[PDB]
Design a protein around this ligand. Structure first.
Ligand SMILES: N#CCc1nccn1CC(F)(F)F
Ligand SMILES: [Cl-]
Ligand SMILES: [Zn+2]
Ligand SMILES: [Zn+2]
Length: 563
């Protein structure tokens, strides 16, 4: 502990030697406090002016206004611990069968920062001194020591660009080489895209079994145990030479021991430490969350099938039974799930899964909004299952071909598009962000009447050649959106046997009007009728603010506006 954290703490203490104050009123129970020192969402106007009816919907307007991290998870039982290690060992082998671990490069890192001591990260990557500091820490990590890998809590834990690269170097391959691809993981959806998730849930529904279960975990990142962090580290058993040592060092020194700087208003910076819970880059968090969630859900499926009786201790024959289950049905059982970090849908063999709660509760993966020992409520219809903040409609085109389309409450979609992240945005930057939302809506949400109309209005109000700005983001392009639609929904869609291109937006269907209203459409209101009727006047208001640019009228892509 202090041997691994001291240097990091020793170092911060000196840079603030004229402030070190061991505040005795520190609020930390579960975090080890080490000392203190002295320290100190905007509305997108283009989207809002073209969505006026929503100016009076509180669910939209409130979205733009405005003691769980300090908890302690218990050590699981011996039987639980054995089930986790055996499952983790087998899972890493399976993920590894068709992938080779490998180091990610300065080059790869240098490129990303350029596609989004030093002001920005863009500058540091172009300074040799930064890489020299990286070299110093890198050689420190080969030595089994750490000086500069310190979390900054804000719950999103920032590190300085150097520590990020060393994380990326060692573990980037998990994301960069698609370890949690459905093809490689069977349960995963990494890189799948929102136009694929519905087809994937429908494929799970086709399996023989019971209800579909979609239990959310109450603060997944705070329930990651030291035993979880150790089972994740076993990916290093698949590595070699330098890589193996670098990966080991990130797991030992930054994940399984942590130093964090936090702002407290009583304003001081508190330097706290702990060994458990999740703390990594958002992208390594995603991959290790998916891995550990895959492991927890295979084990819950084991308990429902009665592969083991007691979590208190596992017999020698029970280890044989668990190992044999994995070898004979593990792959089939993985296929019965869709897992995206802390998010899952499971279609188990039968409904015994609903009351199989002992291992799940003992791993610390306690379900949200349900009593600890109350059986899970399953879904009977795949089109009602929540996954990745969506539900999925089955939608038949005039020509009989089947679209499985993503959906959510339309107030959420309009409230998000009306928000920009940051300040110093030009009108052109603001317009280009509005266009990114409009093109997403045309590609993913075309079946919502209000969104197809608002999307066409925004793309009409923003100069035709201005480039949109901000899994798979096909709407980030200047190509014609009907051509992108055809590629995404027809040409590249493995669930579509007939590849006949669509020739206009009118061949592309909407939900039923009642279904559209159920999911938050304002179709049928007076406010929405006036907006639709007078849309060219809203389009002209925004054109006049942006100025004398080249614009396209997209509204005649819709029949009601086609004269
Ligand atoms: N595994 C990792 C980190 C990662 N993957 C994609 C982007 N990033 C962030 C980084 F650029 F490295 F800082
Ligand atoms: Cl249902
Ligand atoms: Zn370090
Ligand atoms: Zn819907």
């Amino acid at each position: 502990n202090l041997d691994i954290i001291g240097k990091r703490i020793e170092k911060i203490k000196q840079e603030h030697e004229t402030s070190w104050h061991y505040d005795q009123d520190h609020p930390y129970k579960t975090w080890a406090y080490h000392g203190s020192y002295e320290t100190k969402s905007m509305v997108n106007g283009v989207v809002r002016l073209l969505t006026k009816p929503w100016d009076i919907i509180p669910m939209v307007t409130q979205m733009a206004m405005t003691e769980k991290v300090d908890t302690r998870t218990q050590e699981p039982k011996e039987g639980t611990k054995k089930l986790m290690k055996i499952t983790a060992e087998w899972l890493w082998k399976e993920l590894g069968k068709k992938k080779t671990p490998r180091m990610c490069t300065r080059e790869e890192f240098t490129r990303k920062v350029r596609s989004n001591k030093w002001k920005s990260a863009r500058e540091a990557v172009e300074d040799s001194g930064f890489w020299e500091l990286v070299d110093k820490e890198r050689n420190l990590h080969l030595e089994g020591k750490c000086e500069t890998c310190v979390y900054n809590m804000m719950a999103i834990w920032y590190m300085w660009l150097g520590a990020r690269f060393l994380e990326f170097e060692a573990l980037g391959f998990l994301n960069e080489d698609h370890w949690f691809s459905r093809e490689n993981s069977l349960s995963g959806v990494e890189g799948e895209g929102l136009h694929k998730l519905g087809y994937i849930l429908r494929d799970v529904s086709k399996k023989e079994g019971g209800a579909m279960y979609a239990d959310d975990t109450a603060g997944w990142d705070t329930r990651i145990t030291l035993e979880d962090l150790k089972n994740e580290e076993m990916v290093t058993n698949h590595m070699e030479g330098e890589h193996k040592k670098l990966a080991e060092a990130i797991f030992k020194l930054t994940y399984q021991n942590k130093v964090v700087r936090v702002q407290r208003p009583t304003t001081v910076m508190d330097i706290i430490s702990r060994r458990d819970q999740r703390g990594s880059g958002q992208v390594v968090t995603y991959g290790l969350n998916t891995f550990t969630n895959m492991e927890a859900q295979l084990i819950r499926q084991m308990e429902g099938e009665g592969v083991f009786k007691s979590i208190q201790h596992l017999t020698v024959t029970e280890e044989i039974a668990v190992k044999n289950w994995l070898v004979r049905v593990g792959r089939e059982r993985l296929s019965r799930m869709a897992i995206s970090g802390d998010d899952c849908v499971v279609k188990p063999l039968d409904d015994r899964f609903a009351s199989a709660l002992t291992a799940l509760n003992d791993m610390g993966k306690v379900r949200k909004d349900i009593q600890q020992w109350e059986p899970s409520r399953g879904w009977n219809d795949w089109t009602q299952v929540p996954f990745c903040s969506h539900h999925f409609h089955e939608l038949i085109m005039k020509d009989g071909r089947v679209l499985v389309v993503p959906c959510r409450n339309q107030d959420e979609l309009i409230g998000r598009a009306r928000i920009s992240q940051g300040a110093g945005w030009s009108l052109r930057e603001t317009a280009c962000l509005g266009k990114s939302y409009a093109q997403m809506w045309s590609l993913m949400y075309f079946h919502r009447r209000d969104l197809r109309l608002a999307a066409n209005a925004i793309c009409s109000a923003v100069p035709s050649h201005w480039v949109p700005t901000s899994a798979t983001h096909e709407w980030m392009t200047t190509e014609d959106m009907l051509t992108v639609w055809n590629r995404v929904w027809i040409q590249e869609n493995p669930w579509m046997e007939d590849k006949t291109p669509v020739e206009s937006w009118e061949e592309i269907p909407y939900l039923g009007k009642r279904e559209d209203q159920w999911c938050g459409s304002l179709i049928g209101l007076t406010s929405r009728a006036t907006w639709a009727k007078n849309i060219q006047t809203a389009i002209n208001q925004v054109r006049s603010l942006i100025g004398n640019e080249e614009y396209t009228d997209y509204m005649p892509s819709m029949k009601r506006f086609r004269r």
